Amino acid sequence: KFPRVKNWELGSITYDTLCAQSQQDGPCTPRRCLGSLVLPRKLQTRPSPGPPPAEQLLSQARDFINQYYSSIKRSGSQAHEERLQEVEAEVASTGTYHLRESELVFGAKQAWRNAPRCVGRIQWGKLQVFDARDCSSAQEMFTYICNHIKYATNRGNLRSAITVFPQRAPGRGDFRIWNSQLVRYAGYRQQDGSVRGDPANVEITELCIQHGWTPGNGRFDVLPLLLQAPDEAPELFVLPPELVLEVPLEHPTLEWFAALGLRWYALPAVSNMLLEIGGLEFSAAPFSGWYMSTEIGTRNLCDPHRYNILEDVAVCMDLDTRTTSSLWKDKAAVEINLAVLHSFQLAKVTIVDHHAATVSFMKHLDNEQKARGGCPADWAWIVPPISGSLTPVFHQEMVNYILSPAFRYQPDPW
Amino acid sequence: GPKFPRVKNWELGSITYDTLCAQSQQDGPCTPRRCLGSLVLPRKLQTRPSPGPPPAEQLLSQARDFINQYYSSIKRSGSQAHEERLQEVEAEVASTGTYHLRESELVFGAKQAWRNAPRCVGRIQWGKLQVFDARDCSSAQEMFTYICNHIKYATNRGNLRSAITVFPQRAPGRGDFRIWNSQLVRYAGYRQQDGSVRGDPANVEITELCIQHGWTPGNGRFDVLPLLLQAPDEAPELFVLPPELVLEVPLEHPTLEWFAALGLRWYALPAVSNMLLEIGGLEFSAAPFSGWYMSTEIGTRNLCDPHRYNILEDVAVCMDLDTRTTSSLWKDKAAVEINLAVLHSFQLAKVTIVDHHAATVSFMKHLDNEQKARGGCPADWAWIVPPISGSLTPVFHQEMVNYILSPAFRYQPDPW
Ligand code: HEM
Ligand code: HEM
Ligand SMILES: C[C@H](O)[C@H](O)[C@H]1CNc2nc(N)[nH]c(=O)c2N1
Ligand SMILES: C[C@H](O)[C@H](O)[C@H]1CNc2nc(N)[nH]c(=O)c2N1
Ligand SMILES: N=C(NCCC[C@H](N)C(=O)O)N[N+](=O)[O-]
Ligand SMILES: N=C(NCCC[C@H](N)C(=O)O)N[N+](=O)[O-]
Ligand SMILES: [Zn+2]
């Protein structure tokens, strides 16, 4: 029942008892493991055909509230009971309820803390929670989003933050941010079928053009936002260039790298995920912290289905691109990651390398082992895309399981 | 649509459905509640020493299943021969309590087992395996002769050939044939006074177990351990490998002259010798196998793991890198060069080796082949993706479904 978890570098061992609190099922079954799959369809968050059994929501809600009060140690107090009564009251009459700002702040933090795929969870306690449930239009989301970006960026000294927009309402549309991240480079499919820019953003780039945006023709054209208000066609808003901080990329000892004119934005801000707290679902809650160098240098720039600049660089490095055994890929990958780290540090913008980052995650596991008796972690996502066993987490066994509050994936609006 | 795991490759955007997992008749460690897919040894395949023969009934189902597998592999499923072999196996379990495999059935099962290994990335070669039957073997001395012939044939003076040597299956009331060593060729780990370890820290226990058994220990970092071979109900005996049989490769770098000076070296033949080979229910406690190395096994795990040779620092210093700050990627840089050194050295020494790129590319080919032949392929992602340049290989972008198929290679408790 309670997993025996071992680290193979320190022979240490623990017993994950935190998974007992998991009330949602993953994709694995005793017959076959599907832990390496990216998406579900089973862990997904289907829209609202109607009101969910008052008993269900009520239960998720009762549990969350209990969490919040244990949180502030006032468990069993009067306020705790009066708060439960409240929630049961609202639900019984309207089929739903709402959260107090202090609970939202607690929930958002627990959601990050429970994020099995996040390696930066050691920062979970420090989170700036902008409340935007007081939003009635897309015009407004744009402003809120602009405030978040402005604050989170802080001229390079990045600060973690999340902005929570109106929870989903049964029998009503959903506030939604169509973009996958608040900031992403457009992908233009040029005749040859090939792509100019970011292949990952071909679709969202299309949709934008389809709603009026007049595209550009560059490799790094910052995409406009397509904010959607309940049951209304999305609206298009361009992001103020002064607002979008970017880091030109150059290399420490290789003068030519800069020539490549590669660049990347400073704010990683996933914006299409769903935040679920006490049964409530927040369809639009963008969050941001700061990049870990490999996300840009390894996946974004070297993925074959991304900017795939791996060969262009090896050529310049005068490498033997003829055979695999020359390790021209491994050699060029490390320089590109070095270049990202170097450039961000030079532009005085927050960034964390994969070594330092996984070290902090180890500490986090420790801190969490003591605090809750375990930590849900997705091994395949926690181990960096390069130098895996070269980091401490590669050698750490992990247990994956779903806990709430939680960030979950959700279907595309279109 | 389909009632089977939907699998996607995010690089090419292609989709496949795995129907082969429905053929697994043995649960793993996961549950809808939590996934334990990153655990190295969850108690599942594990075969705690059963006092006697499997439950008369249970052993029948397993056995009847393997036979079905054999006849279908030869396209004679449902034939007179197939049905008779079935009647035969049953009768033998009904009278003796166990049963034996015809030669061709053993070769078949062995290959299946490899073919089914979820953690092996070189399975594209599963059909090409030399199976030395050695079920006649009756002594620890005899065990030593077979093993030597294996290394002789498998090493083949540089041009390695995949092979496996199968010894007598577990018998009721009779001890097992066990090879105490983890691999046929291993370097000694000497426990020091100051607490450290000279050689390979992994092999410390087996090194101390050979000494207890009269081995006269040396004192270098790369000392080839002796073999602790054990026959049924006897205590193990010791045997030393003739240096001429154990091919070894000195490591040097293609452009860094000093690397050669480090005096680093590795043996060419990898041979897991402690795994259990299970076929049709029959358990072969000793059945060493070998193929050939993949660059990263040596250049990343053995040489750079903190709990192994841990040479990352020494090499980084020699390259004049900033080891006092992770953001310099001094670890990534040195690792790349150490791996390039293992590759270079083997090539230079006409010894078979495969790098992680070619290896994983060929595995993708293997997945496509199996998709067509069996409707899928059991794979352990954490083990398939190389320890360096992970997302730079095609396997990183390929989702995988892990499950247990038999024949199989299962981990087993140390004999001691
Ligand atoms: C403090 C800086 C942070 C760092 C360094 C960090 C780093 C990471 C990295 C490396 C990933 C994998 C991303 C990928 O490969 O696509 C990840 C995933 C994730 N992080 Fe964090 N994170 C940070 C802050 C945050 C914050 C502020 C939140 C929310 C409050 C958050 C929520 C998540 C979630 C939900 C995922 C998975 C998203 C997905 O499945 O696409 N992270 N994080
Ligand atoms: C000829 C080329 C071969 C290559 C390049 C190859 C490579 C590999 C690699 C990289 C691993 C993981 C090593 C580790 O992480 O410690 C592995 C594991 C394994 N291979 Fe292969 N393999 C080959 C041949 C064989 C043969 C001939 C057999 C058996 C007949 C086999 C059976 C297995 C099994 C059982 C495992 C898992 C062992 C464990 O759990 O530690 N392999 N192979
Ligand atoms: C197929 C496989 O699950 C997929 O490529 C995963 C692997 N590990 C990952 N790890 C992180 N951090 N991010 C990812 O997107 C992935 N992709
Ligand atoms: C803890 C974790 O499961 C462990 O370090 C695994 C990860 N992937 C691996 N992959 C291979 N090929 N070999 C290994 O020994 C491991 N070790
Ligand atoms: N670091 C974070 N990353 C979110 C995903 C970003 C994506 N890998 C990419 O654009 O490369 N989260 N965060 O810090 O909030
Ligand atoms: N390549 C193989 N490796 C088996 C494990 C070897 C181990 N990692 C090591 O010695 O580094 N098997 N094989 O090819 O038969
Ligand atoms: Zn699993």
Phi then psi for residue A52, to 5 deg, are -70, 140
The Cα B41–Cα A13 span in angstroms is: 13
Residue A115: C-alpha distances to residues A110, A122, A333 (Å):
9, 11, 28
Q: Residue B381: CB within 6 Å of ligand 4? A: no
- In A, minimum Cα distance to B307 occurs at A9
Residue nearest to atom 22 of ligand 1 (CA): A120
The Cα B51–Cα B48 span in angstroms is: 9
The domain defined by A134-159+174-245+409-413 carries CATH number 3.90.440.10: yes
The Cα B277–Cα A132 span in angstroms is: 61
**Helix or strand (DSSP H, E) at B408:** strand B408-410
The Cα B123–Cα B121 span in angstroms is: 6
Q: What is the DSSP string of A72-91?
A: TT-TTSHHHHHHHHHHHHHH
Determine contact, residues A348/A316, Cβ cutoff 8 Å: no
- Structure-token pair, residue B188: 């000694």
- Beta bridge partners of residue B183, listed in sequence order: B272
Q: Per the CB < 8 Å rule, is A390 touching B392?
A: no
Q: What is the 3-state secondary structure (H, E, C) of B135-185?
A: CCCCCHHHHHHHHHHHHHHHHHHHCCCCEEEECCCCECCECCCEECCCECC
Residue A8 annotated as part of some ligand binding site: no
Q: What is the DSSP string of A166-232?
A: ----TTS---EE-SSBSS-B-EEEETTTEEEE-GGGHHHHHHHHHTT-----SSS-BPPEEEE-TTS
- In A, minimum Cα distance to B306 occurs at A9
Q: Per the CB < 8 Å rule, is B403 touching A32?
A: yes
Give B140 to chain A, closest Cα distance, Å: 33
Domain range summary for chain B, segments of one domain joined by +: 18-135+162-172+276-290+360-384, 136-161+176-247+411-415, 248-270+293-358
Residue nearest to atom 12 of ligand 1 (CA): A118
Instruction: Assess whether the region B18-135+162-172+276-290+360-384 and the region B136-161+176-247+411-415 belong to the same CATH fold.
Output: no
User: Topology of domain B136-161+176-247+411-415, per CATH?
Assistant: Nitric Oxide Synthase;Heme Domain; Chain A, domain 2 (3.90.440)
Provide CB contacts within 8 A for B275, sequence distance 6+: B287, B289, B409, B410, B411, B412
Maximum Cα–Cα distance across chain A: 73
Residue A146 annotated as part of some ligand binding site: no
Cα angle B97, B231, B136; round to 5: 65
If you classify domain B248-270+293-358 with CATH, what class do you get?
alpha beta
The Cα A281–Cα B268 span in angstroms is: 57
Strands B6-8, A406-408: pairing is unpaired
Nearest to A401 among B33, B39, B300 (CB): B33
Q: Per the CB < 8 Å rule, is B33 touching A385?
A: no
- Half-sphere CA count of B302, side-chain side, radius 13 A: 23
Locate tokens 């055994």: which residue?
A325
Query: Which residues of B are marked as active site?
Result: 120, 123, 292, 297
A246-268+291-356 CATH choice from 3.40.50.720, 3.90.650.10, 3.40.47.10, 3.90.1230.10: 3.90.1230.10
- Half-sphere CA count of A342, side-chain side, radius 13 A: 17
Q: How many CB atoms within 10 Å of residue A404?
A: 21
The Cα B206–Cα B178 span in angstroms is: 14
User: Topology of domain B18-135+162-172+276-290+360-384, per CATH?
Assistant: Nitric Oxide Synthase; Chain A, domain 1 (3.90.340)
Cα of B363 vs centre of ligand 7, distance in Å, is 21
Nearest to A333 among B40, B301, B392 (CB): B392
Q: Per the CB < 8 Å rule, is B327 touching A333?
A: no
Give B340 to chain A, closest Cα distance, Å: 7
Q: Residue A103: CB within 6 Å of ligand 5? A: no
At A355, the amino acid letter reads H
Q: Residue B292: CB within 6 Å of ligand 6? A: yes
Q: What is the DSSP string of A363-384?
A: HHHHHHHHHHS--B--HHHHS-
**Helix or strand (DSSP H, E) at A102:** helix A101-114
The Cα A120–Cα B27 span in angstroms is: 34
- Beta bridge partners of residue A125, listed in sequence order: none
Cα of B38 vs centre of ligand 7, distance in Å, is 8
- In A, minimum Cα distance to B347 occurs at A325
3-state secondary structure of B282: strand
3-state secondary structure of A4: strand
Rg, Å, chain A Cα set: 23
Maximum Cα–Cα distance across chain B: 72
Q: Residue B41: CB within 6 Å of ligand 4? A: no
The Cα B330–Cα B322 span in angstroms is: 6
Pocket of ligand 1 (CB under 6 A): A 112, 115, 117-120, 123, 127, 160, 162, 270, 273, 287, 289-290, 292, 295, 352, 381, 407
Q: What is the DSSP letter of A323?
A: -
- Residue A54 CA, distance from chain mean position: 30
Cα of A102 vs centre of ligand 3, distance in Å, is 34
In this structure, CATH architecture of domain A16-133+160-170+274-288+358-382: Alpha-Beta Complex (3.90)
Determine contact, residues A105/A286, Cβ cutoff 8 Å: no
The residue among B352, B266, B249 whose CA lies nearest residue B303 is B266
Method: X-ray
Return the best residue to mutate from A36, A37, A104, A117 for the ligand 1 pocket (most ligand atoms within 8 A of CB): A117
* Contacts A–B by Cβ distance under 8 A: 210
- Structure-token pair, residue A152: 């989170």
The Cα B76–Cα B388 span in angstroms is: 45
Name every chain B residue with its beta carbon within 8 A of the beta carbon of A331.
336
Q: Per the CB < 8 Å rule, is B7 touching A337?
A: no
The Cα B232–Cα B141 span in angstroms is: 13
- In A, minimum Cα distance to B5 occurs at A34
Q: Per the CB < 8 Å rule, is B32 touching A26?
A: yes
Q: How many CB atoms within 10 Å of residue A413?
A: 16
- Structure-token pair, residue B51: 């006092």
Provide CB contacts within 8 A for B3, sequence distance 6+: none
Q: Per the CB < 8 Å rule, is A36 touching B400?
A: yes
The residue among B231, B283, B239 whose CA lies nearest residue B415 is B231
Query: Which residues of A are marked as active site?
Result: 118, 121, 290, 295
